Amino acid sequence: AKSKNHTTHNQSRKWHRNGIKKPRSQRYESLKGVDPKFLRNMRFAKKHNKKGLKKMQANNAKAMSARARKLDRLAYIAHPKLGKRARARIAKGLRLC
């Protein structure tokens, strides 16, 4: 009943099939595991943003807002828009003798 015990032979090849997906970017990081006395300040700080300020801050924004030449030449000939008088001379152009 003797067997083999532990090998990470062919584990590099399994992990990188789908790939090492790096989480790296998201916004507004989750707010668990936070120091609770800090949070026992900040929820109060949010509830008086609504109640405590309309007239002071919105008008304060209102105050500060009231405070506030040959090879260069053929591209102009052969441009799609800027060349219709370029054709003043080959089509109906001035050239003539």
Per-residue x/- track, 75-94, RNA (CB under 7 A): ------x--x----------
Asked if residue 7 binds Mg ion (CB under 5 A), the reply is no
* Closer CB to RNA, 47 or 89, in the complex: 47
Kind and range of the H or E run holding 60: helix 55-67
Please pick, from the candidates 3, 10, 18, 30, the single residue that binds Mg ion as defined by CB under 5 A. 3
In angstroms, the CA 27 to CA 38 distance is 21
Cα distances (angstroms) measured from residue 25 to each of 28, 32, 44, 77, 84: 10, 18, 29, 50, 52
Residues that bind RNA (CB under 7 A): 1-22, 24-32, 37-38, 40-58, 60-61, 64-65, 68, 81, 84
